[PDB]
Amino acid sequence: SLSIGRTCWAIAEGYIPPYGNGPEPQFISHETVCILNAGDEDAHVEITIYYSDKEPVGPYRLTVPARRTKHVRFNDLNDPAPIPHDTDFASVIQSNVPIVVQHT
Amino acid sequence: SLSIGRTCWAIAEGYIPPETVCILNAGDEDAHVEITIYYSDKEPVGPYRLTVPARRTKHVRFNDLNDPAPIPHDTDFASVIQSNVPIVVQHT
Amino acid sequence: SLSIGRTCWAIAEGYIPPETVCILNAGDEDAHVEITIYYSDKEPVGPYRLTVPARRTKHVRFNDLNDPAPIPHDTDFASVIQSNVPIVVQH
Amino acid sequence: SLSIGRTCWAIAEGYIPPQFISHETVCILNAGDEDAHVEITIYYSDKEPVGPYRLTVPARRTKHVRFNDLNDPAPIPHDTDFASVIQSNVPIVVQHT
């Protein structure tokens, strides 16, 4: 039915601040992909993470169900591997069905 | 003779703390706008209906939406905004 | 002879407290720009005219616009920016 | 394989005045299989454009370019409004912070 967005989005910036070994502190605001799947089929999302000096890593899989939103924190990604902090990266977000992606 | 924008827009982030869609209708026909609000864990709600007259702008505060239901505060949502005629929608 | 951008841009927010369009013309012909200002409760006002020369930028402050009339402060508005030649516009 | 982005991006604003940083930065992603030979042109209100500033973003890599770090053909004057056009032989994705 309703089809809004597209199957591939790219975010050229990405950086998780080097906060030390506890939780990401209250002070610094993170980076979060906000995804809307306004369609009637579940979105199987695959994120690839790009770096300045090494091969990309992924896919990081996750599902955004039919007619739902999901916020994805880059800091929460861990399969296949966590993203190193204090490191510049970029991502490609791919989906089987159209989705809307925003980065705040 | 001015047709600018499109009939469907989606804003992937929304949150009202425990904000505003600005809409321009630069066209010669009134826009009958419908907003649907999406959530992480429940079915979407709407249509919230409003009119942006010909050759006018309107700022819509999500907090002011109440028919069919108010939007809960401290809740992440997203919206799809649909119109009969092309409109330009922006969010800060 | 680069052609980048487009001839019509719309900015749905505008508010001068009780601000800046940045324009690039990367082309080889001066851009004659016209701005129209839209309101929630009155007919639009314009064209406000200005020129962005070939291969130059220009920052336009909504506050500085005055012909045909200044834009009231503490008032929500929107603008349409139209050009004879493609330009890039950011707010 | 993956082709995402485009060969020409324009950024209409630019200005060079414990842990965060605010230099004007172009973040570029080349998600494609061929290195991007990028050319930056810097545009001014009152003088001719300057460039190309040349740099390479390798295949399947990202690069952060600080406007402050640009110097060939010339450094960009500080406390000066500018704009930039970023051109590439292959599609790239460009974002600025």
**Chain A: residue nearest D4 by CA?**
A10
- Shortest Cα distance from C1 to chain D (angstroms)? 13
Count Cβ–Cβ pairs < 8 Å, chain C vs chain D: 44
Distance CA D28, CA D30 (A): 7
Architecture of the domain made up of C1-91: Sandwich (2.60)
Is-contact D28 D36, C-beta < 8 A?
yes
Of A17, A28, A89, the CB nearest to D62: A89
Which residues of B fall below an 8 Å CB-CB distance to C?
2, 4-5, 22-24, 26, 55-59, 88-90, 92
Of A17, A18, A51, the CB nearest to D62: A51
A67 and B38 within 8 Å at the Cβ level: the answer is yes
D83 and C22 within 8 Å at the Cβ level: the answer is yes
In chain D, beta strands by DSSP E: 6-11, 25-30, 36-44, 50-57, 61-66, 82-96
Q: Which residues pair with B45 in a beta bridge?
A: B37
- Give the DSSP per-residue string, A17-49: ----SSSPPSSS---EEEEEE-SSS-EEEEEEE
Q: Which residues lie closer than 8 Å to B58 by C-beta, 6 or more apart?
A: B22, B23, B25, B50, B52, C40
Distance CA C62, CA C40 (A): 17
Quickly count: other Cβ atoms within 10 Å of residue B24's Cβ: 28
Q: Which residues of D touch A57 (CB under 8 A)?
A: none
Q: Which residues lie closer than 8 Å to B7 by C-beta, 6 or more apart?
A: B82, B83, B84, B85, B86, B87
Q: Which residues of B touch A36 (CB under 8 A)?
A: 10, 12, 38, 78, 80
Q: Does the CA dihedral B71-B89-B60-C23 come out positive or negative? A: positive
Q: Which residues lie closer than 8 Å to A26 by C-beta, 6 or more apart?
A: none
Is the peptide bond between B68 and the residue preceding it cis, with omega within 30 degrees of 0?
yes
CA–CA distances in Å: residue D65 to residues C31, C66, D53, D70: 30, 39, 11, 8
List all chains that touch chain C, counting a touch as 3 or more CB pairs closer than 8 Å.
B, D
Q: Which residues lie closer than 8 Å to C7 by C-beta, 6 or more apart?
A: C82, C83, C84, C85, C86, C87
Q: Which residues of C touch D51 (CB under 8 A)?
A: none
Of A69, A71, A104, the CB nearest to B38: A69
- Shortest Cα distance from C24 to chain D (angstroms)? 6
Position B30: which residue type? D
Which pair of tokens denotes residue C32? Answer: 């004659």
CATH fold group of domain A1-104: Hypothetical Protein Tm1070; Chain: A (2.60.290)
Distance CA D23, CA D15 (A): 9
Q: Which residues of D touch C26 (CB under 8 A)?
A: 10, 41, 43, 85
Q: Which residues of D touch C24 (CB under 8 A)?
A: 10, 12, 43, 83, 85
Closest CA to A44 of A83, A70, A15, A80: A70
Position D96: which residue type? H
**Core vs surface per residue D2-34: b (16+ CB within 10 A) or e:** eebbeebbbbbbbebeeeeeeebbbbbbbbbee
Experimental method: X-ray
CA–CA distances in Å: residue B46 to residues A37, B26, B66: 16, 25, 10
Position D54: which residue type? R
Of D8, D44, D48, the CB nearest to C57: D44
C38 and B56 within 8 Å at the Cβ level: the answer is yes
Query: What's the CATH number for B1-92?
Result: 2.60.290.11
C90 and D48 within 8 Å at the Cβ level: the answer is no
Distance CA C13, CA B22 (A): 6
Which pair of tokens denotes residue B1? Answer: 């003779």
Position C78: which residue type? A
Residue with tokens 């399947």: D60
Q: Does the CA dihedral C52-C58-C59-C65 come out positive or negative? A: negative
- Give the DSSP per-residue string, chain C: ----SEEEEEE---B----EEEEEE-SSS-EEEEEEEEESSS--EEEEEEEE-TTEEEEEEGGG--SS-PPPTT-BEEEEEEEEEEEEEE-
Name the class of domain D1-97: mainly beta
Is-contact D65 D88, C-beta < 8 A?
no
List all chains that touch chain B, counting a touch as 3 or more CB pairs closer than 8 Å.
A, C
Q: Which residues lie closer than 8 Å to B72 by C-beta, 6 or more apart?
A: B16
Is-contact B42 B69, C-beta < 8 A?
no
Domain spans in chain B, listed from the N-terminal domain onward: 1-92
Is the peptide bond between C68 and the residue preceding it cis, with omega within 30 degrees of 0?
yes
Q: Using alpha carbons only, how large is chain C's radius of gyration in Å?
A: 13
- Shortest Cα distance from D18 to chain C (angstroms)? 30
Closest CA to C77 of C25, C40, C46: C40
Grouping H, G, I as helix, E, B as strand and the rest as coil, residue D73 is coil
